């Protein structure tokens, strides 16, 4: 068992991209390292400076009949001096001596806590970088209020969020399964022959053979299961799809794409800003217990016994003898296996109450209803995204910018190449029911419940 | 078992839509991914910028004999300086030095809490984005009061809400079913033959065969069920159908539709603003317990026994022998299955009392009547929509705007295409009673009560 | 089992209605969706803008010798400066410098709480939108007092209410039925033959056959029922039929009817303002318990037994044998079903006492007489309509307006078409006693007490 990492050879140098003065080249990954071998360490993509031999046109947008700002975002004239940071670099609340004319008037209006990070541009592994391509500070001069249940406030709705409810949806699943199987097998045998021959001046011949045999098999098995899962949802959100504003640090990174399907830059872009964006989330976070017991007793026995009681004797003078032989054997074999797994997981909430709750779960005693309530009041402060409906990031690249369809054509294939080349289906699978897991480019396998070996080979 | 996602090829590029300068093209989805395969990730619809080769007419409404505003909504002259935000951008309470003449006079008149979000533009999955196409701030210079039971106030009726009652309709269902079936089968057999032959100088021949057999089968079964469901309704609402005002961020998105049935834009519109709007809701929210027990004991036995007691002996001299043989067998097999499911769900109410109530339900002890009362007083703050009578969103697109019937003809087919192409009837169904569920474009199946496999195959 | 929704094809485009500049067309619904199929979603009626090719006359009323107002209601000269909002837009208390001359003088006179919403324009489903076609602010310069029992005040009688009493009519029904049936059947059989034949040097032949049989059947059944129903009535009302004033937002919607029996607009009108108006109601609200128990025990047994005891033996030398055989069988089968349903419902009253009362009902303990009294004092605040005598809405369209009889001829057939096309008698009925219920255009069936299937097929 010895597998090492591998690399494909590099490709050819494509072209000096004239709008970036760099030629790119790339390669792929054949086989990731496995079974205590060398790690691949993500060495795809390469860059090299070159002089532009044939210069491109000046790639800048027209920004027709709109006030250009000091960032690159083009806003309208209606957003002038509105008291809202619309250009990004505060190009409204400085210029004029006119009225600030706030569209949210003297009504009690605050800033939100859930809508401001409403992108959660997610990656296909499952973890979510908050590198939001959206900009949740652009209000576009509107004042739409969305109520809160507990605090009785009036939060705002940013322009990129199309809907934002605050329900209170608590939901506890609970299961406990139980299996048991006893079996007691049993087999006894007793045999006996007693032969006696007598002549008549005589001759005798006796034999008393007494065989016995005995076998038991008293084996039980047991297999429990338990599963608590209590979700707590506080609302949701749904993002938009047309006339969407993007943040400042993202339009530039789309504008710096090599436009010719150069493979090196897109694998950096898709891990800087994620693969998909959560177009419809649901905040508030869960907890979970799992209690997998397992038991396997076994007995087996054997009780064996033999006897021969011979004799002889005759009067003619006298002669006699008496012979005895007796053997006994016994075997007891009592085996036992026992396994207990406990897993607990808990997401969301303040640091002080959630880790009271986790240990009150794992103690096994009953939890008085003051810690789940305190954690559920805590979850308003620190929400954790729990369920999302994805959407690809090339459904977000704007069309106003130059070479938009070519960059979308690049990003629609880069996601296929990213999901293919880092897939788990390149490492050869582990035997004995071992589930292979790609991690750090090093396919580690998890063995079920009995196998301590890396290849799930050694048993107990 | 290995299914991956599939895609149809793209269509042809239709036409530069001259009023939007973009040509659209699209495709469909053949088979969603299933059984631990690649996800489809919603890649329908495509956009591309193009120069308008043949320009359209200037698509703007006439707004005949009405005061146009700084949003696009056309109000009447009666709404001038009324002290109500009718244009959306406050084009009443700024202009004149005349009287504000409030139609709600010095009577105690407030703003509502249930009517202001009275659209709940819903989607066919079951969840409800609050992206209200209606505008519940337009009062049209009228003062219609609707009373409250508990607080004794006088809320208003916005123009888009046609009726709004506040009942107090509490309604608890409760069920508990119970099934049980014991059975005890039993079968015993005893056999015996005793033969004895004697001559007469003699010869004997004996045999004592003693067979026995014994079988039990003592199996019981049990299957409980419980179901609490206590709804609490606080009123309802019924929206209108003619002379309806729409919000500012929705008439623009209808005006930006490609008018030629271009499939890419309508699938973004129908998931920005939902598929249907709740034309008749009922607020106030439920809770629910479900307690599905299951039990299956089983015993079976077997007790077997054999015996042969032969003999022989004669005087002529003497000879005799006595032979004994005896076998015994026993099997006990005692199996047991047990399953407990508990589900609890709770909607509506403040964060502090509802999650006291849920754990007081799941404890199993009796709940003193102070937590259901406190949750029911809490439900006035945070209502949750509970029952609705839908209506399609192409019964809402106004007819005053240009190309209204063509856009309604597009939206009446886009709902059929949306309900067909994301239907569950494309994924091949799971066996063993597994109910397939479309989720994230990845058809996951739920297996009933015994099957841990993805295809519901492995049993216990 | 697979039924989907269906639609008839659309009709022909009728005519540009010249007073509304819109041609209408429509269709019908053949079969609603049923058994987990596609929903119809109410797609009847259609509108389309068209230029008026032949213009109609200016549809406005004469309003002969009456002061026209700024709404469209024509009041008399006697109502000038009376201090009552008669035109709707306050065209009395602004103009003159004369006396306000209130017809209710310095006597203690208030505004009502039950008469102000005295329409309750109801729909044929059973639920009641408060979209009152009547106007319960028009007093017509009269001062008619109607007393109150508890508060000792003097409420007013609006012109649309012809009579208004405040009784106090409490009425509790109570039932408890009980059925029980035990039966114990029993059948035992014992048989025996003992034959013995002896010769005489001999020969014997014996036989002792001993059969037995035993059967029980000890099954009981029980079926309880309980039904509390305590109504509490506080008064009633009776509306008028001639010289009736209607509200401002209803004469316009009658005036916007297409006049040619165009089917699309009337199905929106009849669900904006209901099908009938409650011409004679009775306020104050009920509560209700239902306790349906069900039990079905069953036993059955069987105890079977057989025996053959043969023998033979003769002296001639000697020979004999003895043969025994004995079988035993036993079956016990003990089945049990149990069902408990509880339903509770409660209408009317403040939020704090009614939901104390509901849980004091469902606890099963006796309720001390302090919660029913507090709920009955609460019911003065929040009444709920409980019994009504309907009347069709085309007995309410005024005759002064133009094309009144044609619109009444349209509305007298639109109610027949509405009650026919959304009737439950289009969905094919469910078997096994399943009652079909039309809901959301999706005929769901309810199965009685044992059947969990959608088509009431699977039993227990
Ligand atoms: C994958 O690994 C897990 C780890 O415990 C194991 O339980 C499971 O049986 C493996 N196989 C599959 C198909 O999930
Ligand atoms: C669908 O899945 C559920 C999940 O438990 C199962 O109970 C049910 O039998 C399945 N089939 C149908 C027809 O609902
Ligand atoms: C209708 O459905 C109900 C639901 O329980 C059932 O009790 C009744 O027998 C059905 N049939 C009729 C004729 O009411
Ligand atoms: C990467 O590219 C270099 C270019 O010189 C090769 O030499 C190397 O073997 C690898 O393919
Ligand atoms: C989408 O459309 C492109 C257009 O070039 C095709 O090449 C592709 O195969 C897919 O159909
Ligand atoms: C509705 O009416 C249209 C009119 O073109 C038909 O094409 C359609 O089939 C339905 O009947």
Short mmCIF file of C-alpha atoms in Angstrom, two decimals, chain B residues 86-387:
data_model
loop_
_atom_site.label_atom_id
_atom_site.label_comp_id
_atom_site.label_asym_id
_atom_site.label_seq_id
_atom_site.Cartn_x
_atom_site.Cartn_y
_atom_site.Cartn_z
CA UNK B 86 -49.40 58.52 -2.74
CA UNK B 87 -46.80 58.88 -5.49
CA UNK B 88 -44.26 56.95 -3.43
CA UNK B 89 -41.69 59.76 -3.50
CA UNK B 90 -43.71 62.10 -1.30
CA UNK B 91 -45.10 64.32 -4.07
CA UNK B 92 -48.05 65.51 -1.95
CA UNK B 93 -46.74 66.87 1.37
CA UNK B 94 -44.21 69.30 -0.13
CA UNK B 95 -45.78 71.42 -2.85
CA UNK B 96 -48.70 73.52 -1.69
CA UNK B 97 -49.22 75.89 1.22
CA UNK B 98 -52.85 74.75 1.42
CA UNK B 99 -54.44 72.63 4.14
CA UNK B 100 -53.24 69.04 4.59
CA UNK B 101 -57.02 68.15 4.92
CA UNK B 102 -56.58 64.64 6.40
CA UNK B 103 -59.54 62.37 5.59
CA UNK B 104 -58.88 60.62 8.87
CA UNK B 105 -59.78 63.53 11.15
CA UNK B 106 -59.05 63.99 14.88
CA UNK B 107 -60.51 60.53 15.59
CA UNK B 108 -57.95 58.14 17.08
CA UNK B 109 -56.57 56.51 13.93
CA UNK B 110 -53.35 54.48 13.74
CA UNK B 111 -51.42 52.44 11.19
CA UNK B 112 -52.01 48.72 10.90
CA UNK B 113 -49.73 45.75 11.51
CA UNK B 114 -51.40 43.01 9.43
CA UNK B 115 -52.60 44.90 6.37
CA UNK B 116 -49.26 46.46 5.49
CA UNK B 117 -47.81 43.16 4.22
CA UNK B 118 -51.05 41.80 2.77
CA UNK B 119 -49.66 40.38 -0.46
CA UNK B 120 -47.48 37.41 0.48
CA UNK B 121 -46.68 36.62 -3.14
CA UNK B 122 -46.28 32.91 -2.79
CA UNK B 123 -44.39 30.20 -4.66
CA UNK B 124 -45.59 26.71 -5.56
CA UNK B 125 -43.15 24.98 -3.20
CA UNK B 126 -45.09 26.18 -0.16
CA UNK B 127 -42.86 28.91 1.25
CA UNK B 128 -43.91 32.54 0.95
CA UNK B 129 -41.68 35.48 0.00
CA UNK B 130 -43.22 38.72 1.27
CA UNK B 131 -42.24 40.48 -1.99
CA UNK B 132 -45.66 42.05 -2.17
CA UNK B 133 -46.67 43.19 -5.65
CA UNK B 134 -49.35 45.29 -3.97
CA UNK B 135 -48.63 48.62 -2.31
CA UNK B 136 -50.21 48.79 1.15
CA UNK B 137 -49.43 52.46 1.74
CA UNK B 138 -51.85 53.84 -0.86
CA UNK B 139 -54.97 55.00 0.98
CA UNK B 140 -56.58 57.03 -1.87
CA UNK B 141 -57.89 59.67 0.53
CA UNK B 142 -60.31 57.44 2.43
CA UNK B 143 -60.68 56.65 6.13
CA UNK B 144 -62.19 53.21 6.76
CA UNK B 145 -61.72 51.89 10.29
CA UNK B 146 -61.44 48.23 11.31
CA UNK B 147 -61.55 47.45 15.00
CA UNK B 148 -59.28 45.33 17.16
CA UNK B 149 -60.48 43.00 19.87
CA UNK B 150 -57.75 43.07 22.49
CA UNK B 151 -56.02 46.43 22.15
CA UNK B 152 -59.24 48.43 21.41
CA UNK B 153 -57.74 50.55 18.64
CA UNK B 154 -58.87 51.64 15.17
CA UNK B 155 -56.54 50.41 12.44
CA UNK B 156 -56.87 51.52 8.83
CA UNK B 157 -57.84 49.68 5.68
CA UNK B 158 -55.45 50.25 2.76
CA UNK B 159 -56.89 50.47 -0.73
CA UNK B 160 -55.58 47.09 -1.84
CA UNK B 161 -57.29 45.25 1.05
CA UNK B 162 -61.02 44.81 0.41
CA UNK B 163 -61.93 43.25 3.76
CA UNK B 164 -60.17 42.69 7.05
CA UNK B 165 -61.81 41.09 10.07
CA UNK B 166 -60.20 40.29 13.42
CA UNK B 167 -61.92 37.21 14.82
CA UNK B 168 -60.44 34.98 17.51
CA UNK B 169 -60.86 31.47 16.21
CA UNK B 170 -59.09 28.85 18.29
CA UNK B 171 -59.27 25.27 17.11
CA UNK B 172 -57.56 22.21 18.56
CA UNK B 173 -57.63 18.83 16.90
CA UNK B 174 -56.40 15.88 18.94
CA UNK B 175 -56.10 12.23 17.96
CA UNK B 176 -54.68 9.10 19.48
CA UNK B 177 -54.88 5.78 17.69
CA UNK B 178 -53.74 2.47 19.04
CA UNK B 179 -53.40 -0.98 17.52
CA UNK B 180 -52.26 -4.17 19.18
CA UNK B 181 -52.11 -7.82 18.14
CA UNK B 182 -50.82 -10.68 20.25
CA UNK B 183 -50.62 -14.22 18.92
CA UNK B 184 -49.41 -17.37 20.68
CA UNK B 185 -49.17 -20.51 18.55
CA UNK B 186 -48.21 -23.83 20.08
CA UNK B 187 -47.69 -27.40 18.84
CA UNK B 188 -46.54 -30.37 20.95
CA UNK B 189 -46.04 -34.01 19.91
CA UNK B 190 -45.19 -37.03 22.08
CA UNK B 191 -44.57 -40.43 20.49
CA UNK B 192 -43.62 -43.74 22.06
CA UNK B 193 -43.26 -47.36 21.00
CA UNK B 194 -42.27 -50.11 23.43
CA UNK B 195 -41.80 -53.51 21.77
CA UNK B 196 -40.83 -56.65 23.72
CA UNK B 197 -40.30 -60.09 22.17
CA UNK B 198 -39.50 -63.13 24.33
CA UNK B 199 -38.79 -66.69 23.25
CA UNK B 200 -38.26 -69.76 25.44
CA UNK B 201 -32.73 -71.55 26.09
CA UNK B 202 -34.28 -68.17 25.25
CA UNK B 203 -33.86 -64.99 23.20
CA UNK B 204 -35.17 -61.51 24.00
CA UNK B 205 -35.48 -58.38 21.89
CA UNK B 206 -36.65 -55.11 23.42
CA UNK B 207 -36.95 -51.55 22.14
CA UNK B 208 -38.22 -48.40 23.87
CA UNK B 209 -38.27 -45.51 21.39
CA UNK B 210 -39.49 -42.22 22.88
CA UNK B 211 -39.77 -39.27 20.50
CA UNK B 212 -40.85 -35.80 21.51
CA UNK B 213 -41.29 -32.49 19.70
CA UNK B 214 -42.30 -29.06 20.92
CA UNK B 215 -42.79 -25.71 19.21
CA UNK B 216 -43.94 -22.30 20.42
CA UNK B 217 -44.44 -18.98 18.66
CA UNK B 218 -45.32 -16.12 21.02
CA UNK B 219 -45.23 -12.89 19.02
CA UNK B 220 -46.91 -9.61 19.84
CA UNK B 221 -47.12 -6.39 17.86
CA UNK B 222 -48.14 -2.87 18.77
CA UNK B 223 -48.50 0.37 16.83
CA UNK B 224 -49.49 3.62 18.51
CA UNK B 225 -50.15 7.05 17.00
CA UNK B 226 -50.82 10.48 18.44
CA UNK B 227 -51.49 13.84 16.78
CA UNK B 228 -52.08 17.16 18.48
CA UNK B 229 -52.75 20.15 16.20
CA UNK B 230 -53.84 23.43 17.70
CA UNK B 231 -54.45 26.27 15.27
CA UNK B 232 -55.10 29.83 16.44
CA UNK B 233 -56.51 32.25 13.88
CA UNK B 234 -56.52 36.03 14.26
CA UNK B 235 -58.55 37.28 11.35
CA UNK B 236 -58.01 37.17 7.61
CA UNK B 237 -57.89 39.42 4.54
CA UNK B 238 -59.18 39.52 0.97
CA UNK B 239 -57.34 41.49 -1.70
CA UNK B 240 -58.91 43.25 -4.68
CA UNK B 241 -58.90 42.54 -8.41
CA UNK B 242 -59.62 45.79 -10.31
CA UNK B 243 -58.17 49.32 -9.98
CA UNK B 244 -55.29 47.84 -7.99
CA UNK B 245 -52.14 49.85 -7.34
CA UNK B 246 -48.79 48.07 -7.55
CA UNK B 247 -45.49 48.95 -5.91
CA UNK B 248 -42.73 50.87 -7.66
CA UNK B 249 -40.24 47.99 -7.91
CA UNK B 250 -42.70 45.75 -9.78
CA UNK B 251 -44.15 47.79 -12.65
CA UNK B 252 -40.56 48.32 -13.83
CA UNK B 253 -39.84 44.58 -13.74
CA UNK B 254 -42.98 43.91 -15.76
CA UNK B 255 -41.86 46.66 -18.16
CA UNK B 256 -38.46 44.93 -18.55
CA UNK B 257 -39.93 41.68 -19.88
CA UNK B 258 -38.67 40.65 -23.34
CA UNK B 259 -42.20 40.63 -24.91
CA UNK B 260 -41.36 37.87 -27.44
CA UNK B 261 -41.51 34.83 -25.10
CA UNK B 262 -37.82 34.74 -24.40
CA UNK B 263 -37.54 31.95 -21.84
CA UNK B 264 -34.55 33.29 -19.89
CA UNK B 265 -36.12 36.33 -18.25
CA UNK B 266 -39.41 34.80 -17.07
CA UNK B 267 -37.71 32.14 -14.94
CA UNK B 268 -35.91 34.96 -13.15
CA UNK B 269 -39.09 37.01 -12.77
CA UNK B 270 -41.15 34.12 -11.37
CA UNK B 271 -38.54 33.46 -8.70
CA UNK B 272 -38.02 37.11 -7.91
CA UNK B 273 -41.71 37.84 -7.30
CA UNK B 274 -43.19 34.38 -6.79
CA UNK B 275 -45.64 32.43 -8.90
CA UNK B 276 -48.95 33.33 -7.23
CA UNK B 277 -50.17 36.00 -4.84
CA UNK B 278 -52.26 35.17 -1.80
CA UNK B 279 -55.58 36.74 -2.76
CA UNK B 280 -57.23 35.48 0.46
CA UNK B 281 -55.12 34.57 3.48
CA UNK B 282 -55.65 33.90 7.18
CA UNK B 283 -52.93 34.84 9.63
CA UNK B 284 -52.08 33.38 13.04
CA UNK B 285 -50.01 30.23 13.38
CA UNK B 286 -50.23 26.60 14.43
CA UNK B 287 -48.28 24.03 16.35
CA UNK B 288 -48.16 20.26 15.97
CA UNK B 289 -46.95 17.11 17.70
CA UNK B 290 -46.68 13.65 16.12
CA UNK B 291 -45.74 10.57 18.17
CA UNK B 292 -45.31 7.46 16.02
CA UNK B 293 -44.36 4.48 18.12
CA UNK B 294 -43.84 1.02 16.66
CA UNK B 295 -43.01 -2.27 18.33
CA UNK B 296 -42.50 -5.80 17.08
CA UNK B 297 -41.52 -8.46 19.54
CA UNK B 298 -41.15 -12.06 18.39
CA UNK B 299 -40.26 -15.30 20.07
CA UNK B 300 -39.89 -18.77 18.65
CA UNK B 301 -38.68 -21.96 20.26
CA UNK B 302 -38.01 -25.61 19.60
CA UNK B 303 -37.45 -28.45 22.08
CA UNK B 304 -36.58 -31.80 20.53
CA UNK B 305 -35.83 -35.07 22.27
CA UNK B 306 -35.02 -38.66 21.31
CA UNK B 307 -34.34 -41.89 23.18
CA UNK B 308 -33.64 -45.54 22.32
CA UNK B 309 -33.32 -48.03 25.18
CA UNK B 310 -32.45 -51.42 23.69
CA UNK B 311 -31.68 -54.59 25.61
CA UNK B 312 -30.95 -58.26 25.03
CA UNK B 313 -30.18 -61.22 27.23
CA UNK B 314 -30.43 -65.00 27.32
CA UNK B 315 -29.60 -67.98 29.51
CA UNK B 316 -28.47 -71.04 27.57
CA UNK B 317 -23.90 -69.95 30.12
CA UNK B 318 -25.28 -66.38 30.02
CA UNK B 319 -25.07 -63.38 27.74
CA UNK B 320 -26.66 -59.94 27.95
CA UNK B 321 -26.26 -56.32 26.97
CA UNK B 322 -28.10 -53.07 27.58
CA UNK B 323 -27.78 -50.15 25.14
CA UNK B 324 -29.01 -46.63 25.83
CA UNK B 325 -28.96 -43.60 23.55
CA UNK B 326 -30.51 -40.22 24.20
CA UNK B 327 -30.34 -36.94 22.31
CA UNK B 328 -31.71 -33.54 23.22
CA UNK B 329 -31.87 -30.32 21.21
CA UNK B 330 -33.11 -26.86 22.05
CA UNK B 331 -33.37 -23.54 20.22
CA UNK B 332 -34.66 -20.24 21.58
CA UNK B 333 -34.78 -17.24 19.23
CA UNK B 334 -36.02 -13.98 20.73
CA UNK B 335 -36.08 -10.99 18.38
CA UNK B 336 -37.29 -7.48 19.07
CA UNK B 337 -37.68 -4.28 17.08
CA UNK B 338 -38.73 -0.95 18.52
CA UNK B 339 -39.07 2.43 16.80
CA UNK B 340 -40.04 5.77 18.26
CA UNK B 341 -40.49 8.90 16.17
CA UNK B 342 -41.45 12.25 17.63
CA UNK B 343 -41.94 15.35 15.48
CA UNK B 344 -42.79 18.75 16.87
CA UNK B 345 -43.37 21.93 14.91
CA UNK B 346 -44.41 25.40 16.02
CA UNK B 347 -44.98 28.60 14.04
CA UNK B 348 -45.72 32.15 15.07
CA UNK B 349 -45.14 34.06 18.29
CA UNK B 350 -42.36 35.77 20.16
CA UNK B 351 -39.04 34.01 20.66
CA UNK B 352 -39.39 33.64 24.43
CA UNK B 353 -42.73 31.85 24.94
CA UNK B 354 -43.03 29.57 21.89
CA UNK B 355 -39.86 27.66 22.74
CA UNK B 356 -41.04 27.27 26.28
CA UNK B 357 -44.24 25.79 24.81
CA UNK B 358 -42.47 23.35 22.46
CA UNK B 359 -40.40 21.77 25.22
CA UNK B 360 -43.43 21.67 27.52
CA UNK B 361 -45.12 19.66 24.76
CA UNK B 362 -42.25 17.24 24.22
CA UNK B 363 -41.67 16.55 27.92
CA UNK B 364 -44.87 14.51 27.92
CA UNK B 365 -46.08 15.96 31.21
CA UNK B 366 -49.27 17.98 31.42
CA UNK B 367 -48.97 21.67 30.56
CA UNK B 368 -50.55 24.01 33.07
CA UNK B 369 -52.66 26.64 31.33
CA UNK B 370 -50.22 29.52 31.49
CA UNK B 371 -47.90 28.79 28.53
CA UNK B 372 -50.52 28.26 25.83
CA UNK B 373 -52.18 31.47 27.03
CA UNK B 374 -48.87 33.35 26.94
CA UNK B 375 -48.07 32.03 23.47
CA UNK B 376 -51.55 32.99 22.32
CA UNK B 377 -51.04 36.50 23.67
CA UNK B 378 -47.65 36.46 21.96
CA UNK B 379 -49.16 35.57 18.58
CA UNK B 380 -50.55 39.10 18.19
CA UNK B 381 -46.97 40.35 17.76
CA UNK B 382 -45.59 37.84 15.23
CA UNK B 383 -48.26 36.30 12.98
CA UNK B 384 -47.52 33.57 10.45
CA UNK B 385 -49.66 32.93 7.38
CA UNK B 386 -51.47 29.62 7.69
CA UNK B 387 -54.05 29.14 4.89
#
